[PDB]
C-alpha cells in the first residue's frame, strides 16, 4: 500500500507548498490522494526542496565526509547538517566512496481537481456574498424593466 | 476577510454627544464617601580521589522544566 511517487504527484506537491506553505501538510494531503501528510512532509524535506544539494562530490567533500563519518560514527542526521546535504544521499556516497577500495487516465482527474482547488481562494463567505450581490442586481434589473414595460403602457 | 485588526480605536468623541441613560450600576453605588487628607576501600574504584535578563535562559526556568516534565 506504501506507494511510489509519480511525477504528477510530485508536481502537485510542489504547487501545493507554493501556495499553502510548508507547515500546512494536511492542506497538502487533501489535494494529494493516496498520500499522507507525513509522506508529503517527508518528501519535500528530503527530496523536493530546491535548497537541497544533489550534485557531484569534490575531493574536499569526500575528505570531509570520511573525516566526519570517522569522528561522528554513524550519526547521519548530524553529518548531513555538517555537510549541508540530504542524509540518504550522504549515506549513498559513503557507501560508494568506500567501494573505491575494491578487490494518466486517473492522474489527470486528480490534477484537474488540484488545478481548480489551487485557483479558488475565497471560501463560503466571499462566494456567498458574490451570489447575493448577483441575485440582488438581478432583482434590481427585473424591477426596473417592469417599470419601463408599464411605462410603455403609459401607466406610471 | 471579516477578521480585522484596528486601524484606529473607538473615540470618546462619539459617546460625548449621545444622550445619557441613567441606568443604575452596582459599582457606582455610594462607597468611600469621605476623602482622607494628608497632614583502603576507596582505592579500588575507577575515579574519586548571577542574574541573566532572559526568561528562557534563567536558572529558575531550568529548575522548572526539570521538575515539571520528569
Amino acid at each position: 500500500k506504501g506507494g511510489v511517487w509519480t511525477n504528477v504527484e510530485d508536481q502537485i506537491l510542489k504547487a501545493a507548498v507554493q501556495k499553502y506553505g510548508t507547515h500546512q501538510w494536511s492542506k497538502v494531503a487533501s489535494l494529494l490522494q493516496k498520500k499522507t501528510a507525513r509522506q508529503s512532509e517527508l518528501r519535500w524535506n528530503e527530496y523536493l526542496n530546491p535548497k537541497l544539494n544533489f550534485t557531484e562530490f569534490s575531493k574536499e567533500e569526500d575528505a570531509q565526509l570520511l573525516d566526519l563519518a570517522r569522528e561522528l560514527p554513524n550519526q547521519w542526521r548530524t553529518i548531513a547538517d555538517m555537510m549541508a546535504r540530504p542524509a540518504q544521499v550522504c549515506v549513498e556516497r559513503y557507501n560508494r566512496l568506500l567501494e573505491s577500495e575494491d578487490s494518466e487516465d486517473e492522474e489527470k482527474e486528480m490534477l484537474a481537481e488540484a488545478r481548480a482547488r489551487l485557483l479558488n481562494t475565497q471560501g463560503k463567505k466571499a462566494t456567498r456574498k458574490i451570489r447575493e450581490r448577483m441575485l440582488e442586481e438581478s432583482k434590481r434589473i427585473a424591477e426596473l424593466q417592469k417599470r419601463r414595460e408599464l411605462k410603455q403602457a403609459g401607466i406610471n | 476577510t471579516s477578521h480585522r485588526p484596528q486601524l484606529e480605536a473607538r473615540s470618546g468623541a462619539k459617546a460625548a454627544a449621545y444622550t445619557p441613560t441613567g441606568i443604575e450600576h452596582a459599582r457606582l453605588l455610594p462607597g468611600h464617601t469621605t476623602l482622607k487628607y494628608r497632614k583502603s576501600w576507596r582505592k579500588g574504584t575507577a575515579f574519586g580521589r548571577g542574574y541573566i535578563n532572559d526568561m528562557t535562559k534563567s536558572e529558575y526556568h531550568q529548575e522548572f522544566l526539570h521538575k515539571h516534565v520528569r
Partner: protein, 627 residues
C-alpha cells in the same frame, strides 16, 4: 508613511512571534536594522508574558486551584514548546562547546567496561543469522507486544491502520518479514522522523515518542532479541532492576528482608553504624553521548547492530512547528531503549562499586549469586558496601561502617569543607511523612557521617555522565542515636526498627512487615510501610484525568474508569494505605467527585435523591457498580 505601509509592517510582528514559538530564527533579508530592533524588543516583551503565564498557571494546576478546562490544554501546549526550546538550546550548547565528556574520562569509562567483561568472560551477542533456532518465536513475541495496543481501542487512524496491516503481513509471511528486518539491521542508517507529544499528569508533563510503524517492527524484533540474548549470556548482574523475575512490591520485600538477614547491622554495641543512600541519577539518559555509546556497544554486540542502535537515536524530533535533530540525548520512546538504558547504567554501576566489589556482589561468572547473596561471609565483611541495587535511574546503597572506618570517612570530608557554625543539619533532607520521633534524628555525628558518605559517592561518577546532587539525595544513618533506617523503594515509603531497639514490642496491623532472620527463623525487625507522597499526588492526578476528559460521558464509563484506577491503586500498594492518612483523604475526596459527576449528569446534587444503592449496586441490577 500611510495606512498601507503601517498595515504591512505589522505582519512582520506576527511572523516574528510565530518564528519565536517555533524556535526558528526570524531574519528578514533587507529588513531595516532600526525596525528589526523594535520588533525583537517587543517579541521578547511578549515572550516574557508568555513564559511567566506558563509558570503561573502550572503552579495553579498542581494545587488544583480552579483552572479552566481549556487552560489545562493551553498550559500543556505552552510547556511543550518551552520544553523543546530548552531541549534545542541544550543541543546547540553540546554542538558548540563539544561533548561534555573529556577524552580522559571516556578512555577510563571504556577501560572499566573492557576490564569487567573480560572478567565475566562475556561473549558478545552476534547478529542473528537466518538459521537461528529461536527466530520465529522472538518475532511472534515482538508482534504480539505491538498488537496489544490495538486490542483495546475501537477506532484507528491512517497511521494505526497502517500499523495493523504491517503486523498481519508479518503474521502471514514470517519468513519474508525476517528478511526485511535482517536487511534493515545491516543496511538502513537513515530513519524517518519521530513525532513527539506530551502527556499531562497535572504535576509533571511526560514525553511520548511516536516511531514510524514500519520502523517500529524492526525495533520490536530487536528489543526481543537483545533482551533474550542478554539473559542467556548473563549480561546484566543481579542488582539491575526491574528484574524480570519479581514484581516491584516483591523487590521492596526482598530488599527489606535482605537487609535484616545480613549479619550484625542492628548490633550497635560498638560505635558501628549503617548507612543507606538513595539518589536519582539526574539526567541520565539525557546525557548519553552517542560516540561513546557506539564504542561501548561494540563490546557486547556485533557492530552491525551496534551501528543500528546509534543511527536510530539520531533522528528528527517533530512537534507541530518545532523540528530539530537529536544530536545528543537518548530517545526513551524506542523499543530497544530499555536495553541501552540498563547497559549504560551498568557502566555507572561499575564506577560506584569498582571492579573488585562488583565482582563480589555479582559473584563469579560460572556460578553467579542471587540478588542479595555472597559466596561466603568473609567476602561480605570486606569492603563496607554491603548491598547495592539500581532501579531505572535510582540507586540504593547499604554501607556498614565500624567506628574507626566511620571516623576516617567523616574526617576527610570535614578536612575538605568544614563548617564552623555547624550548618550541615540545615540542608539535610529527611522524610517529613514519618513522625519526628520516627524519622532521622539530626545528630551532628550522624549528619556529618551522612554527608561524607554522599561525598565519596558523588566523586566516583563524573558530572559529564549523570548529575548526582544532594537535593536529590536521601541518606539515612542507623546508629546508636538513630534507631530507624528509612528508605523509599518503588513508591513504598519504609521505616525499619529492629526488635531490640524498640521500647516495647507491641502487636501491629497489616501495614507492618515482620522481618525474619534466615537462620534463627525469628522476627528480629519490623518494617513500617507507607505510600510515598509522590504516589499519592500521582493517584489524585488520575482522578482529575477521569473528570477533565469526561465532558459528557455516560455514567457507567465514569464508574468503570473509577474502578480500574482504584483497583490499580489498591492491588499495587496493598497494605500500605492503612498507615497513610493523606491518602485516605484523597480516596474520600476522589470518590465523591466521581459521584458528583453523576449528580452533575442530572441537575441535582441532592443527597436524598442518590442513596448508596444508586452508585454501588452491580451493573447486572442496573447500578453503576462502583467499588
Amino acid at each position: 508613511i500611510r495606512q498601507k505601509k503601517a498595515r504591512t509592517i505589522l505582519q512582520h510582528l506576527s511572523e516574528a512571534w510565530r518564528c519565536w514559538k517555533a524556535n526558528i530564527p526570524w531574519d528578514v533579508p533587507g529588513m531595516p536594522a532600526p525596525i528589526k530592533k523594535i520588533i525583537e524588543r517587543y517579541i521578547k516583551s511578549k515572550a516574557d508574558a508568555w513564559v511567566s503565564a506558563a509558570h503561573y498557571n502550572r503552579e495553579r494546576i498542581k494545587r488544583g486551584a480552579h483552572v479552566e478546562k481549556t487552560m489545562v490544554k493551553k498550559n500543556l501546549g505552552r510547556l511543550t514548546r518551552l520544553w523543546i526550546k530548552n531541549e534545542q538550546e541544550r543541543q546547540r550548547q553540546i554542538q558548540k562547546n563539544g561533548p561534555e565528556i573529556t577524552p580522559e574520562e571516556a578512555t577510563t569509562i571504556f577501560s572499566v567496561m573492557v576490564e569487567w567483561l573480560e572478567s565475566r568472560s562475556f561473549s558478545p551477542i552476534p547478529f542473528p543469522p537466518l538459521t537461528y533456532k529461536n527466530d520465529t518465536k522472538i518475532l511472534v513475541l515482538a508482534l504480539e507486544d505491538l498488537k496489544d495496543v490495538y486490542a483495546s481501542k475501537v477506532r484507528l487512524n491512517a497511521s494505526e491502520r497502517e500499523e495493523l496491516a504491517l503486523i498481519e503481513e508479518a503474521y502471514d509471511n514470517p519468513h519474508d518479514t525476517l528478511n526485511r528486518i535482517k536487511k534493515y539491521l545491516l543496511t538502513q542508517r537513515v530513519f524517518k522522523p519521530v513525532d513527539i507529544t506530551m502527556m499531562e499528569n497535572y504535576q509533571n508533563i511526560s514525553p511520548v515518542y511516536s516511531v514510524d510503524p514500519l520502523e517500529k517492527i524492526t525495533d520490536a524484533y530487536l528489543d526481543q532479541y537483545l533482551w533474550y540474548e542478554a539473559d542467556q549470556r548473563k549480561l546484566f548482574p543481579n542488582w539491575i532492576k526491574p528484574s524480570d523475575s519479581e514484581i516491584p512490591p516483591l523487590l521492596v520485600y526482598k530488599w527489606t528482608q535482605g537487609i535484616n538477614n545480613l549479619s550484625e547491622i542492628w548490633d550497635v554495641s560498638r560505635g558501628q553504624s549503617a548507612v543507606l543512600l538513595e539518589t536519582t541519577l539526574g539526567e541520565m539518559a539525557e546525557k548519553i553521548d552517542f560516540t561513546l555509546l557506539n564504542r561501548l556497544l561494540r563490546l557486547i554486540v556485533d557492530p552491525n547492530i551496534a551501528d543500528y542502535i546509534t543511527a536510530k537515536n539520531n533522528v528528527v524530533i517533530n512537534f507541530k512547528d518545532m523540528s530539530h535533530v537529536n544530536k545528543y540525548g537518548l530517545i526513551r520512546g524506542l523499543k530497544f531503549a530499555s536495553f541501552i538504558f540498563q547497559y549504560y547504567g551498568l557502566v555507572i554501576d561499575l564506577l560506584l562499586l569498582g571492579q573488585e566489589r562488583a565482582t563480589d556482589l555479582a559473584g563469579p561468572a560460572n556460578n553467579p549469586n542471587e540478588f542479595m547473596q555472597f559466596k561466603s561471609k568473609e567476602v561480605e565483611k570486606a569492603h563496607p558496601i554491603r548491598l547495592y541495587t539500581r532501579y531505572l535511574d535510582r540507586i540504593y546503597m547499604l554501607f556498614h561502617f565500624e567506628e574507626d572506618e566511620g571516623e576516617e570517612l567523616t574526617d576527610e570530608y570535614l578536612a575538605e569543607n568544614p563548617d564552623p557554625n555547624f550548618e550541615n543539619s540545615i540542608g539535610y533532607n529527611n522524610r517529613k511523612c514519618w513522625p519526628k520521633d520516627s524519622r532521622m534524628r539530626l545528630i551532628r555525628q550522624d549528619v556529618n557521617l551522612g554527608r561524607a558518605v554522599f561525598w565519596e559517592i558523588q566523586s566516583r561518577v563524573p558530572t559529564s555522565l549523570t548529575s548526582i546532587k544532594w537535593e536529590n539525595a536521601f541518606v539515612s544513618v542507623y546508629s546508636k542515636n538513630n534507631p530507624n533506617l528509612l528508605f523509599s523503594m518503588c513508591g513504598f515509603e519504609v521505616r525499619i526498627l529492629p526488635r531490640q531497639r524498640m521500647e516495647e514490642v507491641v502487636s501491629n496491623d497489616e501495614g507492618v512487615w515482620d522481618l525474619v532472620d534466615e537462620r534463627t527463623k525469628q522476627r528480629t525487625a519490623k518494617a513500617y510501610l507507607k505510600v510515598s507522597e509522590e504516589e499519592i499526588k500521582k493517584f489524585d492526578s488520575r482522578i482529575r484525568g477521569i473528570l477533565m476528559a469526561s465532558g459528557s460521558t455516560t455514567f457507567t464509563k465514569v464508574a468503570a474508569k473509577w474502578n480500574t484506577s482504584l483497583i490499580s491503586l489498591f492491588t499495587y500498594f496493598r497494605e500500605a494505605i492503612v498507615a497513610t492518612e493523606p491518602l485516605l483523604d484523597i480516596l474520600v475526596k476522589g470518590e465523591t467527585r466521581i459521584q458528583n459527576r453523576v449528580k452533575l449528569g442530572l441537575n441535582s446534587k441532592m443527597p436524598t435523591r442518590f442513596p448508596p444503592a444508586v452508585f454501588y449496586t452491580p451493573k447486572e441490577l442496573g447500578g453503576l457498580g462502583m467499588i
